[PDB]
Symmetry: none
Subunit: 73 residues, 6 copies
């Protein structure tokens, strides 16, 4: 290798390593964003329990008809 | 108040009573069909206890893994 | 078995039969109304069965999220 | 027809008419029960409104993922 | 550039590159974790759409019960 | 560091940099794939507006029929 090629190559490598850094950080931003977007979905449990209680309440309104069904079917 | 009139009234009244039997039987069958339509009510009601169970299990798991850990 | 007896009993029956026509028209109106009214009621019970299935589906899918939190946190 | 056969007839019609009154009262009880069974379902509005709130709460958990979607595609 | 300046730049470039590797391995791990976590999250979004349709169906069926009330009461 | 060691180091780093460009295109595509998965979420969210409205209309109608 000539000293010229060592210099050109080292200069071309630095321009790439520079671009990789900018690309990384940007990627890291999108990753963090997605991670953070996921977090609130862990608290779905409470809303699912509310859905269950709504379901149970809807069913309960049919108690009298269900009793009629038990006697006539 | 003629005997003739009483006989004719009885026969006419008999027809009317038969007409009422027919009409009443149709009303019965209409109510029966309405009662037959309670089936989805029964099928609906049958699903709630299983749902209450899987939800209770979810709540426990959420409690253990997220409320504390 | 007197003629006055036959006539009075026939007049009695006549009015009872007339009464029943009236009672039957009333039940017929009430049945028509129930046919109209119970149609959406029964239809809704079908939608409530769907709601219950969708709720259980939510629960099972959210369970996978819980397994992820257990497995990755 | 004879006077004998009138009492025969008149008596026989009273049994049918009597029987019809019983069948009709039995039917009236079934109608009443179905009418009473329908009533509680009128109150489903409040519960459907609760379901709507649940739906909106569930959607709201995805606000941050949805923000990410907006900025990226 | 002199020879001593080429070695300055090289040892300086190696340190960002060795850092970048460690950073990218960490980013890789975080994306892998997201790939697992977002599976049930996206899946639940589909169930929530179903839920929303079910709610709209409940409202439309119940509307007919409200129409029944309006006409018969 | 001799001239030879500077050359060997350069080629050593050139290889490491090559593998990092490759890995970054990979990590880029995985993220982009996850992001495309946000459509079902966008689709879910666009429906809530209509749903609130028809429910509000139902509630109002119910209240009117009570009054």
């Amino acid at each position: 290798m000539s000293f010229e090629e060592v210099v050109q190559t080292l200069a071309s490598l630095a321009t790439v390593v520079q671009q990789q850094t900018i690309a990384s950080e940007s990627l890291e931003q999108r990753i963090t964003s997605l991670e953070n977007g996921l977090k609130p979905v862990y608290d779905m449990a409470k809303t699912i329990s509310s859905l269950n209680r709504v379901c149970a309440e809807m069913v309960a309104k049919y108690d009298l008809l269900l009793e009629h069904h038990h006697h006539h079917h």
